Design a protein around this ligand. Structure first.
Ligand SMILES: c1cnc(N2CC[C@@]3(CCOC3)C2)cn1
Length: 93
């Protein structure tokens, strides 16, 4: 049965106005800005942007990839699909 989300988990993350997007739950570095309550730091592959999202917008990657893991015209998306599939735990700093 599912656990709560934890750093390192791979998802498609949904934001208003964008397609479900390959992403990971990030760690918060020592000294770094914490998310608001009930929110997770989401790192979007390809764009390499961070946003804070709750579980309603987080779809586990394994379950969702057949639906959401197809090329998209949007900037950074296809790079994002390569990242999540090929090196999802790398440093993208
Ligand atoms: C400015 C502000 N937010 C933006 N996005 C928020 C979600 C998004 C999906 C892929 O990367 C992150 C795009 C883009 N530009």
């Amino acid at each position: 049965m599912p656990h709560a989300f934890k750093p390192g988990d791979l998802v498609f993350a949904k934001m208003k106005g964008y397609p479900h997007w390959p992403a990971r739950i990030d760690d918060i570095a020592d000294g770094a800005v914490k998310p608001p309550p009930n929110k997770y730091p989401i790192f979007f592959f390809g764009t390499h942007e961070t946003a804070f999202l709750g579980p309603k917008d987080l779809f586990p990657y394994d379950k969702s990839k057949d639906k959401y893991g197809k090329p998209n015209k949007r900037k950074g998306f296809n790079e994002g699909l390569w990242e999540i599939q090929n090196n999802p735990h790398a440093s993208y700093s």
